[PDB]
Amino acid sequence: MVEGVLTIELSDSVPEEVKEKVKATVEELAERARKEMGLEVKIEEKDGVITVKAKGEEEKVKKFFEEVIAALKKIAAENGLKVETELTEEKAKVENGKEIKGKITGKVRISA
C-alpha cells in the first residue's frame, strides 16, 4: 500500500477556464476511479492548489500516475501551458524495525 499525493499547483496567472475545466476532469476521473477501483482517491484544493492523493497499492497508484501524466502533458502541449512537473517517491523502507511505506509525491505546476 502506497500513497500517491500528486500536488497540482495552478499559477496565479492561469485563466478561470483552466481552474474550472482541470477540476472538472480531475474530479471526474477521480470520482469514477474511486468508485470502480474501490480506492481512497482524495480530492482537495487549498487556495487554487489542487491535490489528488490517490491511496492504494503500488500497481494501482503507478497506473493512475501514468494516466494523470499522459492527460496533463496532452493538455499542456495542445494549449501551450507549462506543466513543469516532478515526482519524489519516498521508498518503502524498514528503518530501525519501523516499516515505513511508500509515498508517490508529485509537485506538478500548470503555468499559463
Largest sheet: 7 strands, mixed
Please provide the ordered H/E string of secondary-structure elements: EHEEHEEEEEE
- Kindly give the count of domains: 1
CATH class (first level) name: Alpha Beta
The whole-angstrom Rg is: 15 Å
How far from one another are the termini? 35 Å
PDB class: de novo protein
Keywords: protein design, de novo protein
Assembly: monomeric
Entry title: A designed protein-A339
Describe the structure concisely for a colleague.
With 112 residues, this protein is α+β, with helices and mostly antiparallel strands. The protein has a single domain, classed as Alpha-Beta Plaits (2-Layer Sandwich), CATH 3.30.70. The protein is built from two helices and nine strands; from the N terminus they run E-H-E-E-H-E-E-E-E-E-E.
Characterize the structure shown.
It is classed as de novo protein. With 112 residues, the chain is of the alpha+beta class. It contains 2 helices and 9 strands; from the N terminus they run E-H-E-E-H-E-E-E-E-E-E. The protein has helices at 16-37, 58-79; strands spanning 2-10, 40-46, 49-56, 82-83, 87-90, 93-95, 98-100, 103-106, 109-111. The strands form 2 sheets. Strands 1, 2, 3, 4, 5, 8 and 9 form a 7-stranded mixed β-sheet that branches. Strands 6-7 form a two-stranded antiparallel sheet. The radius of gyration is 15 Å and the shape is globular. The termini are far apart.
